[PDB]
Amino acid sequence: MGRGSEFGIFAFTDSVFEITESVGRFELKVMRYSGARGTVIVPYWTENDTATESKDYEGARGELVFENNESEKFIDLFILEESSYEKDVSFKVHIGEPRLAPDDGLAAKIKEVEKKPVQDLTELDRILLLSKPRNGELTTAYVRIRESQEFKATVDKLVAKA
């Protein structure tokens, strides 16, 4: 906890998304909820499920930098066209622990406090921990990729033809 933060709370808009291998570049929003104060780094990385990195989509890995009044940042994907008649395939994109930018006032003590023993936490440093930039519960997005939806109109009209 708590339910809020000032730095603040980072998550995807939801867990579940669907394209279209024809979409090219897919912008996936990472939302900053409750208080846009400070500059916060958010790590992200891609991972295979049924969709595979060399074929279905290109691998994306890095960090997002949210400035002082930035409440939104986007991950570009990108998604590979392979003119399939039929496909239902999917991959994951995760976000790691958001961290405050090294230079600003609180960066330390936070990194120092958040790796001392819990039974040693002091009243004020658990206030620090409470105020920390945090993840929401939506820290994994699943991206389902489908056939171009009327490539398949078009194969189907062709199939019915004699």
Swiss-Prot record:
Ubiquitously expressed with higher expression in head compared to body (at protein level). Enriched in photoreceptor cells of the eye (at protein level). In the adult head, expressed in retina, optic ganglia and all neuronal tissues. Contains 2 Calx-beta domains. Calx-beta domain 1 binds two pairs of Ca(2+) ions. Binding of Ca(2+) induces a conformational shift that inhibits the Na(+)/Ca(2+) antiporter activity. Calx-beta domain 2 does not bind Ca(2+). Calx-beta domain 2 contributes to the cooperative binding of Ca(2+) to Calx-beta domain 1. Belongs to the Ca(2+):cation antiporter (CaCA) (TC 2.A.19) family. SLC8 subfamily. Residues 8-147 form the Calx-beta domain. Na(+)/Ca(2+) antiporter that couples the energy of a Na(+) electrochemical gradient to the movement of Ca(2+) against an electrochemical gradient across a membrane, which contributes to the regulation of cytoplasmic Ca(2+) levels. Mediates Na(+)/Ca(2+) exchange in photoreceptor cells and involved in controlling Ca(2+) levels during phototransduction, affecting magnitude of the photoresponse, activation kinetics, signal amplification, response termination, and light adaptation. It comes from Drosophila melanogaster (Fruit fly). It is found in: Cell membrane; Cell projection, Rhabdomere membrane. The gene is Calx. This is Sodium/calcium exchanger Calx. The chain holds residues 555 to 709 of 950 of the full protein. It comes from the Eukaryota.
